């Protein structure tokens, strides 16, 4: 029979861990670090690209920061291809809630369904999990600004500031240190970059190895704007904060 | 050895161990005997209890007015197979208004059991059956074996120690084959044959089971006080 | 691994045999059949003092003329009870009559071998099905996850069973009365249970042709425990 | 060692099951050869009938796939027939759906894509065969396209297959190095067949009686195989060098 | 009883590797070198036609494929996998784009589609990953010219220029020196022919080289006239001759 | 679809995947529940390996199934979401067909059965979750507390705990809970609950959560502030 | 079954719904509440084919209650109406469609403003100051066109409704056995216990 | 248009005594104005001491009797050769008939 | 290794060992033969007698397909039957579509492809039988033999089972010493002899002979069993030659 070649991806270790989730988590620890910091008046996303070559088309590019809807975006740590499967799923779910209720989807609800998908791959079906961890950065008119993370196990949790990918042990302690609740967006922007600067596994932290995004209250009042930084703009903010 | 993992696997000698282990369940089963003349066919089965407080596991199943079988091995498998057989008899009746040939019951059983020896995920039936019937060409006895091999005979036995009763009949052949028009004599010979497969216990009233079918006899089962007559 | 439906070289199904091991680990269950009724009793076995003992339901009604006691992986029996109840009620709908205890049992027993690559593994629980019908009177049946069922005059299953059964061998006779059997079940349970038999860690029940299947109150069993203790002081 | 039983990658990026299917290819111990005329395409394969009990006429590895397409198989017969039946079905269905005869190269591609799948999908094994398709295509002229267990295919000026293939390949390689043309420059298929049998003799260094060979010829609008006699006639003309 | 392999054949090892993707990349590493270069007014993709026999006709085996009139692909690794990918990629360009919007898909989007198929063989039941890395070169009205790389993982990245297969490490270094952001197309063709010569063992001419561009529109290549807005395909294979012309001024 | 029997019997008569599911519960942050005389209190540890959590929006540990029944759990979090959702759906379905909210026993029995189903179905592993389900039956003031575990067995408890170091606090509660005398006030019951958690919990801090359910759908969660006052209170009665 | 009305005043929605249930030749019941509460501040009234009306209302009710529990949050009346519209628009090309018309009146607590939605069995939704289903419109939409002003008190709305019921009692051929009136405002739903 | 039903006439009659019962029916089978057979019996012994007639459209009548007779056979097999009580037969027939509730047996049945 | 534990895996030689193991089961079976004559075919098989309890004549082993085809096999009997049931479905559905009864080469490849199909997947086991079959069609007579691998060819004569070699040699003789042709009734006699000659190897128990034949002149193109007189006449012809 076929059983002979079956890994059994959905089983417990004798200590009660899910082998495959664990090893996928291990996979993600080698991915470019991504950081989310939330302020009283906005959210920041920052992520380090996997050691870019000088020929890679830097500007027309995305591998870390993706747009879910006008109010929600994610930062990716793990397999890019896996993430995009989950992203288009999430983008549809967003659109269905809109069509059904004529209201934009609350941030947590979108996060829950995506996390619930991931969970399914760990309990039934005998397929490998998605080697992906997400930072979700979004706004809704119930909880204001929100940060979440989800991992291959399908667990999610909310954060004031958080990191995923490489060196999150180091990066989390640096954030725990200089974060304060009253903090404003332009400070969080600066904290985020300072943190990657200390935890980056290469020497220079230049603009070409960064993706960056902000979700500000900034607009014509009440409405929320979502900004995915151009490379020139990452260079400008990197000089402005005096990291270059 | 490595080749007994399932039915889909041939050993390097060309044997199917899963089928052979199924054949083994039969031999642990309690003994039962079949035999027929030209006018009747008789099943005699030695029933087994669990302990001193338990019932005696029934071993003979009726399939139609003209057909029936005894079992030795996994009883649920006998129930499945007897059930399948009842349906075929009933379909021959209903569609064709024709009592089903004992020989065809044979081929239908063989073929059903073979399915489970060539596909993955299945398992051989773990039971042996003896089929008696009176049909359009007389008395009949069949020996079903879960490898698929069905065999027409004058008499035989299967289960534990069956080898005694089988050599007995092999001698007694020309005697019983001519017990035509006497039911009680034909039964007698079956009760004697089953005795060659005994040790430590012999036949009491609620451990012996006899069945008969023939020319003017519907397949009927005898147990308890009704078999005292033959002890 | 190897197949879920495979035979040992001995000629038995691995997965059935291992299920039989899990039943041996089960709490004790005893039934005795008499011309006045059938009695079912069980060791409750609360795993901690805090658990509310009468939330343990190891004796369970199937119809007014059929009761059930279980031993082993008891969560596995939930769906067997469901099937039994439905089969009983269904047959009454098709035939305007009570279903025979043997027929009920055979139905439950069909379920049990329906596993493999239908469910993924055999049941980890044995059942004592006990009832009454007009043709064969009072009956007690032992239903295994092998598909086989036997009829017993008396039978014990669970961890206490090896001993308990031998004890039932001496004590059962064809002229037992109901009260005698109740006591006899209480006696043998007390004898095999770890903890000390009282009206909270054991439960009794019976089925009579007249009043059907009743589980006894804690107060009622308490007095049969008293009556038993007193009887055994004598001689 | 399980990355050797099913079609998944080995650590060095190889599919051992595909490789072992290539080895089954030669298990019949037969060599085949194909060449292009101006008007025709000839395929010859060795006929080996060891048993006196066999009916020699039933022993064949050349198949008529369609009216215009011939196929010779290098490998065990059950897999060969399997491939033949399928390509016959595919050729007929193509005609029904698209209103013209299935071309050699298209059929070759289609059969190659099927083989490709067996190398990717786990439950299907590769077939232990190599398929040499031949026709005179209405658009392309004479055509030889070949398919393996890997799912690879390509067109040929000419080709050979089997245990002794390499000697035949180089024999032909050398003729075309010299001749300097894509084909056997001959009027009749009769003489292109003669060419094929000749250079097969030279490369394998063996002699053939009329029952050691099997020949299929593809021409404008029909593909056909030769009988004992049409060959014997052809062997006999070769005797006049 | 048909496909009983309904479980993943690619799984995470304790170290966090997905072995089969790694091995598929190993298989790509073995493949003959291919490359692509973005010019300002064009894109070029190129690779070596390396024949199994000289009896093979290798204009028949075509490693550079048209996917849409403005998109072309080349690869390194296992050719059969590439072949079925080009097939699926051409169909998907219609089924999920042209049949909906009436125009061909933009390069990044079609690339996204391919990546999706390739990703799925990494996860779906009873299959191995694809054994190729693709380079897709394309133009679309709102994005201009672009060049992407698609890996067995289904991950993809855009490049100014790159190479894959056998001699990529060397060739990525060669390109890094010669690439600037002002290259006219003819220059990138020239550079591509030089970069490819390093990695080539045997003969080096128009018959041993397959080379295509995504350049200007070709009305001569359209097949019909009379719709002024339809202007013809930007994808073009160079002839045996056209390559050899540029090996003169090499 | 994926067929494989993942939960099967072992020669000693054990189903290892079920037992390894209990291991995942073992590891889960501690959870407790205590029956008062007119209430049920559910207490829950929250492991302190990380602050910087936004606790407005992180999933809270006690879940409302209906407006009169709640459920806490120990084990895999993602797994518990599935059991909860399913239970919430069944709870509304029961109101639709029976015109009455579920009984705590019924709902427990339902959830228990879902867990059981996953121990003898192909292609699935068991739920790495055990639950406390507590509440009040409709128009009934007598309180209910039940427990389920991955095997599918379920039963009622005067008080009970699950998860990491639950063995420690089951000891404490066995010692500190008179069945003849349940905690009469709400205050009383809540105090007994915090006391038992402090055997295992570290700081009172953001480490403890309490939720209180009184009859007639009267469910309130306690705020850090008020829980602080129980911690402080028992502390100063440590002066013996 | 027969007549259902609604009018949004300054800061409440008022639903009036006929009390009669008739099978052919007999008035089987004269105290029927053609209403389901969907959430603390949302009310749906319904009329149409028998069986279908309640089955639909009860189904929608169950769905909304499940949402409330899952998110621990009451949906806006706009959202609940948009859900209900889609459920109907979905059913209109069904094998057997739902034959039910509804009014959804709710108080949006987040914007402190009452809202009234009129949706027919086809999934045709509109926000109105006042609405009705079936034949009721023909008689009352002329009274309301005249006497309605956007800033009426709740008793001004009820007095205006009184006219509407009176005109229907004058000119409707069917005896609809009066109305049950219910008010939806910032403090929830309550029923005016006689008219 | 194909009419799946017909009507083969005849008439049946059952009377119960103190310790007996009768079921009678004429033996004439007709379509429209022709006689098909002058002796085609429509009252049948179904074993267990039960007699049955399904009068109306013979093909539907025969189908039913045939099915109920089979019901008797399987009742024996499934419940250890028990006798089928006249009331249990009646109930079993209700289910037989109501099973074709939306494509009926055009028969008026008596046992 | 491991190459032999799963059906349809290529060993590195290029073999599928599980087919080869099935061959061993065939080799372990009783002997059967086919002789192709002037206008027909003859089939015979050795039926070992495990006991005087087997009813003689009443355990028939040669099977008919359609009206005009006979099949016999050595090895696992159940498998042989399962393959014949398929041949019967194949031949019925051919006749249903094309009206003409199925030609013998056409029929051979239907069994051919179906047996080969069981070498393509690990989830079925290969057939534990070699099958000799054939009959008369619109183009004369045809004899075929078909192995567990799915390989089959046409034959002048053919044999399989324990007695495969002696039978084989005895058939080779016949081809040489009757090059112009062997008649229908002659081949019935000859078959009887060769079964006896190849009862050398299953010498242990004694046996029952069983023959069938399909001759255009003698059975009118239909498959019939050789019974009563012409049977005993050929039993006698073969008693005479083991002397």
Pairing mode of beta strands F31-35, E65-68: unpaired
Q: Which candidate, I127, I189, I197, places its Cα nearest to that of I159?
A: I197
Nearest CA in chain C to F178: C50
DSSP helix/strand/coil, F121? coil
CB of B156 within 8 Å of a chain I CB? The answer is yes
Look at the alpha carbons of G185, G186, G192, G193 in this order and tell me if their dihedral is positive or negative: positive
Domains of chain A, first to last: 1-244 (3.60.20.10)
DSSP codes of every residue in chain E? ------SBSS-B-TTS-BHHHHHHHHHHHHSPPEEEEE-SS-EEEEEE---S-TTEETTTS-SSEEEETTEEEEEEE-HHHHHHHHHHHHHHHIIIIIHHHSSPPPHHHHHHHHHHHHHHTTTSBTBPPP-EEEEEEEEETTTEEEEEEE-TTS-EEEBSEEEESTTHHHHHHHHHHH--TT--HHHHHHHHHHHHHHT--S--STTSEEEEEE-S--GGGSS--S-SS----SEEEPPHHHHHHHHHT-
Among candidate residues I1, I30, I100, I160, the one labeled active-site is I30
Q: Which residues of G touch F95 (CB under 8 A)?
A: 62, 65
Nearest CA in chain B to A4: B5
CATH number, domain F1-240: 3.60.20.10
Q: Could you identify the residue written with the tokens 């180091």?
A: A170
> What distance in Å separates the CA atoms of residue A101 and residue E120, rounded to the nearest whole number?
33
Q: Which candidate, B75, B158, B156, B147, places its Cα nearest to that of B116?
A: B147
Task: Return the partners of chain A (3 or more C-beta pairs < 8 Å).
Answer: B, C, D, E, F, G, I
Nearest CA in chain E to A63: E157
> What distance in Å separates the CA atoms of residue F65 and residue F107, rounded to the nearest whole number?
9
Residues 6+ away with beta carbon under 8 Å from B188: B230
Number of domains in chain E: 1
- Beta-bridge mates of residue A156: A150
- The angle that helices D228-238 and D189-204 make with each other, rounded to 10 degrees, is 70
CB of A4 within 8 Å of a chain D CB? The answer is yes
Resolution of the coordinates in A?
A: 3.0
Q: Strand B138-144's sheet: what is its strand order? A: B60-64, B67-73, B127-135, B138-144, B150-153
Question: Among C2, C11, C151, whose Cβ lies nearest the Cβ of B21?
Answer: C11
> Chain B residues with CB-CB distance to A under 8 A?
6, 8, 120-121
CA distances from F94 to C85, F103, F148 (A): 21, 10, 20
- Beta-bridge mates of residue F69: F135
Task: Return the partners of chain D (3 or more C-beta pairs < 8 Å).
Answer: A, E, I
Domains of chain I, first to last: 1-243 (3.60.20.10)
Residues 6+ away with beta carbon under 8 Å from A19: A9, A11, A13
Three-state secondary structure along chain H? CCCCCCCCCCCEEEEECCCCEEEEECCCEEECCEEEECCCCCCEECCCCCEEEEEECHHHHHHHHHHHHHHHHHHHHHCCCCCCCHHHHHHHHHHHHHCCCCCCCCEEEEC
DSSP codes of every residue in I179-237? TT---HHHHHHHHHHHHHHGGGTT-SS-EEEEEEEEETTTTTTS-EE--HHHHHHHHHH
Interchain contact, E127 vs D122, CB within 8 Å: yes
> What distance in Å separates the CA atoms of residue I25 and residue I130, rounded to the nearest whole number?
10
Range of the domain at E143: 1-250
Interchain contact, E4 vs I124, CB within 8 Å: no
| Residue I30 is among the residues annotated as catalytic for this protein | yes
Interchain contact, A4 vs D5, CB within 8 Å: yes
CB of G71 within 8 Å of a chain A CB? The answer is yes
Residues 6+ away with beta carbon under 8 Å from D211: D47, D49, D56, D228
> What distance in Å separates the CA atoms of residue A23 and residue E153, rounded to the nearest whole number?
17
CATH number, domain G1-195: 3.60.20.10
Q: Which candidate, I145, I237, I121, places its Cα nearest to that of I187?
A: I237
Nearest CA in chain A to B6: A1
> What distance in Å separates the CA atoms of residue D114 and residue G85, rounded to the nearest whole number?
49
Per-domain residue ranges for chain G? 1-195
Q: Give the CATH fold of the B1-231 domain.
A: 3.60.20
| DSSP secondary structure letter of residue F125 | P
Q: Could you identify the residue written with the tokens 């409302």?
A: F64
Interchain contact, F157 vs C52, CB within 8 Å: yes
Distance from D73 to chain I by nearest Cα, in Å?
14
Q: Could you identify the residue written with the tokens 């007189």?
A: I229
> What distance in Å separates the CA atoms of residue D54 and residue A97, rounded to the nearest whole number?
73
Question: Among F9, F12, F160, whose Cβ lies nearest the Cβ of C15?
Answer: F9
Backbone dihedral region of I239: left (phi > 0), alpha (psi from -120 to 50 degrees) or beta? Answer: alpha
Buried b (16+ CB within 10 A) or exposed e, D169-202: bbbbbebbeeeeeebbebeebbbbbbbbbebbee
> What distance in Å separates the CA atoms of residue A1 and residue E12, rounded to the nearest whole number?
23
CA distances from H87 to H84, H90, H93, H111 (A): 8, 5, 10, 10
Distance from F62 to chain G by nearest Cα, in Å?
12
CB of D6 within 8 Å of a chain A CB? The answer is yes
Residue I228's CB: how many other CB atoms inside 10 A?
8
D191, containing H or E segment: helix D189-204
State the alpha helices, DSSP H only, in C11-148.
14-24, 78-95, 101-112
Look at the alpha carbons of F133, F138, F144, F147 in this order and tell me if their dihedral is positive or negative: negative
Q: What is the CA radius of gyration of chain H?
A: 15
Residues 43-82 of A with CB under 8 A from F: none
Q: Do chains H and C meet with 3 or more Cβ pairs nearer than 8 Å? A: yes
> What distance in Å separates the CA atoms of residue C204 and residue C118, rounded to the nearest whole number?
34
State the alpha helices, DSSP H only, in chain I.
17-27, 77-98, 104-117, 164-177, 184-197, 228-239
Pairing mode of beta strands I140-146, I129-137: antiparallel
Residue B62 half-sphere exposure, CB side, CA atoms within 13 Å? 21
Interchain contact, E118 vs A81, CB within 8 Å: yes
The tokens describing I70, both together, are 């006979």
> What distance in Å separates the CA atoms of residue E179 and residue E182, rounded to the nearest whole number?
9
Nearest CA in chain I to E1: I123
> What distance in Å separates the CA atoms of residue F170 and residue F159, rounded to the nearest whole number?
9
Q: Which residues of A touch G86 (CB under 8 A)?
A: 99-100
Range of the domain at C193: 1-235
| DSSP secondary structure letter of residue F68 | S
Look at the alpha carbons of E174, E176, E178, E179 in this order and tell me if their dihedral is positive or negative: positive
Residues 65-84 of B with CB under 8 A from I: none
DSSP helix/strand/coil, F155? strand
- Beta-bridge mates of residue F73: F131
Number of domains in chain C: 1
Q: Do chains D and F meet with 3 or more Cβ pairs nearer than 8 Å? A: no
> What distance in Å separates the CA atoms of residue F30 and residue C45, rounded to the nearest whole number?
25
Nearest CA in chain A to G86: A100
Interchain contact, B152 vs I58, CB within 8 Å: yes
> What distance in Å separates the CA atoms of residue E154 and residue E73, rounded to the nearest whole number?
15
Provide the CATH number for the domain around residue E215.
Answer: 3.60.20.10
CA distances from A52 to A77, D83, G32, I165 (A): 16, 48, 72, 72
Q: Which residues of I touch B15 (CB under 8 A)?
A: 25
The tokens describing D50, both together, are 């060891």
DSSP helix/strand/coil, A53? coil
CB of I124 within 8 Å of a chain A CB? The answer is no
Q: Which candidate, I124, I102, I104, places its Cα nearest to that of I115?
A: I124
Distance from I237 to chain B by nearest Cα, in Å?
28
Provide the CATH number for the domain around residue C161.
Answer: 3.60.20.10
Interchain contact, A109 vs G78, CB within 8 Å: no
Q: Do chains C and B meet with 3 or more Cβ pairs nearer than 8 Å? A: yes
Residue H74 half-sphere exposure, CB side, CA atoms within 13 Å? 14
CB of A47 within 8 Å of a chain E CB? The answer is no
Number of domains in chain D: 1
Interchain contact, B169 vs I7, CB within 8 Å: no
Buried b (16+ CB within 10 A) or exposed e, B29-57: bbbbbbbbbebbbbbbbbbbbbeebbbbb
Q: Strand F129-136's sheet: what is its strand order? A: F63-64, F69-75, F129-136, F143-148, F154-156
Look at the alpha carbons of G122, G123, G129, G133 in this order and tell me if their dihedral is positive or negative: positive
């Amino acid at each position: 029979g076929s059983r002979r070649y079956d890994s059994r991806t959905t089983i417990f270790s004798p200590e009660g861990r899910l082998y495959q989730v664990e090893y996928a988590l291990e996979s993600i620890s080698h991915a470019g670090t991504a950081i989310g910091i939330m302020a009283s008046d906005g959210i920041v996303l920052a992520a380090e690209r996997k050691v870019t070559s000088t020929l890679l088309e830097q500007d027309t590019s995305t591998e870390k920061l993706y747009k879910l809807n006008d109010k929600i975006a994610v930062a990716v740590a793990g397999l890019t291809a896996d993430a995009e499967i989950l992203i288009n799923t999430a983008r549809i779910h967003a659109q269905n809630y809109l069509k059904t209720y004529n209201e934009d989807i609350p941030v947590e609800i979108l996060v829950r369904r995506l996390s619930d998908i991931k969970q399914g791959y760990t309990q039934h079906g005998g397929l490998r999990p998605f080697g992906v961890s997400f930072i979700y950065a979004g706004y809704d008119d119930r909880y204001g600004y929100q940060l979440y993370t989800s991992n291959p196990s399908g667990n999610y949790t909310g954060w004031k500031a958080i990191s995923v990918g490489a060196n999150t042990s180091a990066a989390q302690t640096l954030l725990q240190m200089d974060y304060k609740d009253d903090m404003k967006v332009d400070d969080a922007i600066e904290l985020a970059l300072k943190t990657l600067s200390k935890t980056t596994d290469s020497s220079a932290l230049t603009y070409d190895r960064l993706e960056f995004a902000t979700i500000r209250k900034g607009a014509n009042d009440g409405e929320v704007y979502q900004k995915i930084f151009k490379p020139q703009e990452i260079k400008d903010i990197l000089v402005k904060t005096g990291i270059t | 050895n490595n080749y007994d993992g399932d039915t889909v696997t041939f050993s390097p000698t060309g044997r199917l161990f899963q089928v052979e282990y199924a054949l083994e369940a039969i031999k642990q089963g309690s003994v039962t005997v079949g035999l027929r003349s030209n006018t009747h066919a008789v099943l005699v089965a030695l029933k087994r209890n669990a302990d001193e407080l338990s019932s005696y596991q029934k071993k003979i199943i009726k399939c139609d007015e003209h057909m029936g079988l005894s079992l030795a091995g996994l009883a649920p498998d006998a129930r499945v197979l007897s059930n399948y057989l009842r349906q075929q008899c009933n379909y021959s009746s209903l569609v064709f208004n024709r009592k089903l040939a004992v020989e065809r019951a044979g081929h239908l059983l063989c073929d059903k059991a073979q399915k489970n020896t060539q596909s993955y995920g299945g398992r051989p039936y773990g039971v042996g059956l003896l089929i008696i019937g009176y049909d359009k060409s007389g008395a009949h006895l069949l020996e079903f074996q879960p490898s698929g091999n069905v065999t027409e005979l004058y008499g035989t036995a299967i289960g534990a120690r069956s080898q005694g009763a089988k050599t007995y009949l092999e001698r007694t052949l020309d005697t019983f084959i001519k017990i035509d028009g006497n039911p009680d004599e034909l039964i007698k010979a079956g009760v004697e044959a089953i005795s060659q497969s005994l040790r430590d216990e012999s036949l009491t009233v609620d451990n012996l089971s006899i069945a008969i079918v023939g020319k003017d006899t519907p397949f009927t089962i005898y147990d308890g006080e009704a078999v005292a007559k033959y002890i | 691994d190897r197949g879920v439906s495979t035979f040992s070289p001995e000629g038995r199904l691995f997965q059935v045999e291992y299920s039989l091991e899990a039943i041996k680990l089960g709490s004790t269950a005893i039934g005795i059949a008499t011309k006045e009724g059938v009695v079912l009793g069980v060791e409750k076995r609360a795993t901690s003092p805090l658990l509310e003992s009468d939330s343990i339901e190891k004796i369970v009604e199937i119809d007014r003329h059929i009761g059930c006691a279980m031993s082993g992986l008891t969560a596995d029996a939930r769906s067997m009870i469901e099937h039994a109840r439905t089969a009983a009620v269904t047959h009454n709908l098709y035939y305007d009559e009570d279903i025979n205890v043997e027929s009920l049992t055979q139905s439950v027993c069909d379920l049990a071998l329906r596993f493999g690559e239908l469910m993924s593994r055999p049941f980890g629980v044995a059942l004592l099905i006990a009832g009454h019908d007009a043709d064969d009177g009072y009956q007690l049946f032992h239903a295994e996850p092998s598909g086989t069922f036997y009829r017993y005059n008396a039978k014990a299953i669970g961890s206490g069973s090896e001993g308990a059964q031998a004890e039932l061998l001496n004590e059962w006779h064809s002229s037992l009365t109901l009260k005698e059997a109740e006591l006899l079940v209480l006696k043998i349970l007390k004898q095999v249970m770890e903890e000390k038999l009282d009206e909270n860690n054991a439960q009794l029940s019976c089925i009579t042709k007249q009043d059907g299947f009743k589980i006894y109150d804690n107060e009622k069993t308490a007095e049969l425990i008293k009556e038993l203790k007193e009887k055994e002081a004598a001689e | 060692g399980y990355d050797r039983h099913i079609t998944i990658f080995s650590p060095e990026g190889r599919l051992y099951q595909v490789e072992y299917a290539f080895k089954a290819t030669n298990q019949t111990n037969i060599n085949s050869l194909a060449v292009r005329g101006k008007d025709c395409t000839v395929v010859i394969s060795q006929k080996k009938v060891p048993d006196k009990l066999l009916d020699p006429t039933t022993v064949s590895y050349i198949f008529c796939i369609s009216r215009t397409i011939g196929m010779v198989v290098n490998g065990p017969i059950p897999d060969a027939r399997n491939a033949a039946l399928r390509a016959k079905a595919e050729a007929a269905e193509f005609r029904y759906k698209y209103g013209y005869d299935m071309p050699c190269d298209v059929l070759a591609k289609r059969m190659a894509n099927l083989s490709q799948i067996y190398t990717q999908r786990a439950y299907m094994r590769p077939l232990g065969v190599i398929l040499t398709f031949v026709s005179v295509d209405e658009e392309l002229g004479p055509s030889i396209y070949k398919t393996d267990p890997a799912g690879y295919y390509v067109g040929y000026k000419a080709t050979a297959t089997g245990p002794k293939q390499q000697e035949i390949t180089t024999n032909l390689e050398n003729h075309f190095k010299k001749s300097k043309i894509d084909h056997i420059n001959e009027e009749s298929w009769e003489k292109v067949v003669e060419f094929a049998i000749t250079h097969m003799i030279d490369a394998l260094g063996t002699e053939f009686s009329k029952n050691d060979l099997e020949v299929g010829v593809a021409t404008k609008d029909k593909f056909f195989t030769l009988s004992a006699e049409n060959i014997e006639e052809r062997l006999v003309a070769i005797a006049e060098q | 009883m048909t496909d009983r392999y309904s479980f993943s054949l690619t799984t995470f090892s304790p170290s966090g590797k997905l072995g089969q993707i790694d091995y598929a990349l190993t298989a790509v590493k073995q493949g003959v070198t291919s490359l692509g270069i973005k010019a300002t007014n064009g894109v070029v993709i190129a690779t070596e036609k390396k024949s199994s026999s000289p009896l093979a006709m290798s204009e028949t085996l075509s490693k550079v494929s048209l996917l849409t009139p403005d998109i072309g692909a080349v690869y390194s690794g296992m050719g059969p996998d590439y072949r079925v990918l080009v097939d699926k990629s051409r169909k998907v360009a219609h089924t999920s784009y042209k049949r909906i919007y009436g125009e061909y898909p933009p390069t990044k989007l079609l690339v996204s589609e391919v990546a999706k198929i390739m990703q799925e063989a990494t996860q779906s039941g009873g299959v191995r990953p694809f054994g190729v890395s693709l380079l897709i070169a394309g133009h679309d009205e709102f994005n201009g010219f672009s060049l992407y790389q698609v890996d067995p993982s289904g991950s993809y990245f855009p490049w100014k220029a790159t190479a894959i297969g056998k001699g990529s490490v060397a060739a990525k270094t060669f390109l890094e020196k010669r690439w600037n952001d002002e290259l006219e197309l003819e220059d990138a063709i020239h550079i591509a022919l030089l970069t490819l010569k390093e990695s080539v063992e045997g003969e080096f001419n128009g018959d041993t080289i397959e080379l295509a561009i995504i350049g200007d529109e070709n009305p001569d290549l359209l097949g019909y006239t009379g719709i002024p807005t339809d202007k013809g395909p930007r994808f073009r294979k160079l002839t045996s001759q056209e390559i050899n012309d540029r090996l003169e001024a090499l | 679809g994926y067929d494989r029997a993942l939960s099967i019997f072992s020669p000693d008569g054990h189903i290892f995947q079920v037992e390894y599911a209990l291991e995942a519960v073992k590891r889960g942050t501690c959870a407790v529940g205590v029956k008062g005389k007119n209430c049920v209190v559910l207490g829950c540890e929250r492991r302190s390996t990380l602050k910087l959590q936004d606790t407005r929006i992180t999933p809270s540990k006690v879940s409302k199934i209906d407006s009169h029944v709640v459920l806490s759990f120990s084990g895999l979090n993602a797994d518990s979401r599935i059991l909860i959702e399913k239970a919430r759906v069944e709870a509304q379905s029961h109101r639709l067909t029976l015109e009455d909210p579920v009984t705590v026993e019924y709902l427990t029995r339902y959830v228990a059965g879902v867990q059981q189903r996953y121990t003898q179905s192909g292609g699935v592993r068991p739920f790495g979750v055990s639950t406390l389900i507590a509440g009040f039956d409709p128009r009934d003031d007598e309180p209910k507390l039940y427990q389920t575990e991955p095997s599918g067995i379920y039963s009622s408890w005067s008080a009970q705990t699950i998860g990491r170091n639950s063995k420690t606090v089951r000891e404490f509660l066995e010692k500190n809970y008179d069945r003849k005398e349940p905690p009469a006030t709400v205050e009383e019951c809540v105090k007994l609950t915090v006391r038992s958690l402090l055997e295992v919990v570290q700081t009172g801090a953001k480490n403890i959560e309490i939720t209180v359910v009184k009859p007639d759908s009267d469910i309130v969660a306690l705020s850090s502030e008020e829980i602080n006052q129980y911690v402080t209170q028992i502390e100063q009665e440590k002066q013996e | 079954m027969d007549i259902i009305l609604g009018i949004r005043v300054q800061d409440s929605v008022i639903l009036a719904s006929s009390k009669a249930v008739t099978r052919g030749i007999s008035v089987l019941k004269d105290s029927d509440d053609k209403t389901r509460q969907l959430s603390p501040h949302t009310l749906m009234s319904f009329a149409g084919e028998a069986g279908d009306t309640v089955q639909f209302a009860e189904y929608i009710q169950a769905n909304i209650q499940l949402y409330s529990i899952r998110e621990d949050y009451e949906l806006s009346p706009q959202a609940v109406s948009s859900f209900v519209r889609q459920e109907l628009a979905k059913s209109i090309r069904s094998r057997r469609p739902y034959q039910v018309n509804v009014l959804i009146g709710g108080y949006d607590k987040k914007k402190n403003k009452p809202e009234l939605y009129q949706i027919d069995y086809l999934g045709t939704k509109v926000e109105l100051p006042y609405g009705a289903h079936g034949y009721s419109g023909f008689y009352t939409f002329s009274l309301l066109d005249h006497h309605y002003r956007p800033d009426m008190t709740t008793e001004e709305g009820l007095d205006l409704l009184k006219l509407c019921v009176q005109e229907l009692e004058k000119r409707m051929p069917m005896d609809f056995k009066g109305v049950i009136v219910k008010i939806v405002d910032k403090d929830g739903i309550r029923q005016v216990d006689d008219f | 248009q194909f009419n799946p039903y017909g009507d083969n006439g005849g008439t049946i009659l059952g009377i119960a005594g103190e310790d007996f019962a009768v079921l009678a029916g004429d033996t004439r089978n007709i379509t429209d104005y022709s006689i098909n057979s002058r002796y085609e019996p429509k009252v049948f012994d179904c074993g267990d001491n039960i007699v049955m007639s399904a009068n109306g459209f013979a093909a539907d009548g025969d189908a039913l009797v045939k099915r109920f007779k089979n019901s008797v056979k399987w009742y024996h097999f499934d419940h250890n050769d028990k006798k089928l009580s006249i009331n249990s037969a009646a109930r079993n027939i209700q289910h037989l008939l109501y099973g074709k509730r939306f494509f009926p047996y055009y028969v008026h049945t008596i046992i | 290794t491991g190459y032999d534990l799963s059906n349809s895996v290529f060993s590195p030689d290029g073999r599928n060992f599980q087919v080869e193991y099935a061959v061993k089961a065939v080799e372990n079976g009783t002997t059967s033969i086919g002789i192709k004559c002037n206008d027909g075919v003859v089939f015979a098989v050795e039926k070992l007698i495990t006991s005087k309890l087997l009813v003689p004549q009443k355990n028939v082993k040669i099977q008919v397909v359609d009206r005009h085809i006979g099949c016999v096999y050595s090895g696992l009997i159940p498998d042989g039957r399962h393959l014949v049931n398929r041949g019967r479905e194949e031949a019925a559905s051919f006749k249903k579509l094309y009206k003409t009864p199925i030609p013998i080469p056409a029929f051979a490849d239907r069994l051919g492809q179906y047996v080969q199909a069981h070498t393509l997947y690990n989830s079925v086991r290969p057939f534990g039988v070699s099958t000799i079959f054939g009959g008369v069609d619109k183009n004369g007579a045809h004899l075929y033999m078909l192995e567990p691998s799915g390989s089959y060819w046409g034959y002048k004569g053919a044999a399989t089972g324990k007695g495969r070699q002696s039978a084989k040699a005895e058939l080779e003789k016949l081809v040489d010493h009757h090059p112009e042709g062997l008649s229908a009734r002659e081949a019935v006699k000859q078959a009887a002899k060769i079964i006896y000659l190849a009862h050398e190897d299953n010498k242990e128990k004694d046996f029952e002979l069983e023959i069938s034949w399909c001759s255009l002149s003698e059975t009118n193109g239909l498959h019939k069993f050789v019974k009563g007189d012409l049977l005993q006449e050929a039993i006698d012809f073969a008693q005479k030659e083991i002397n």
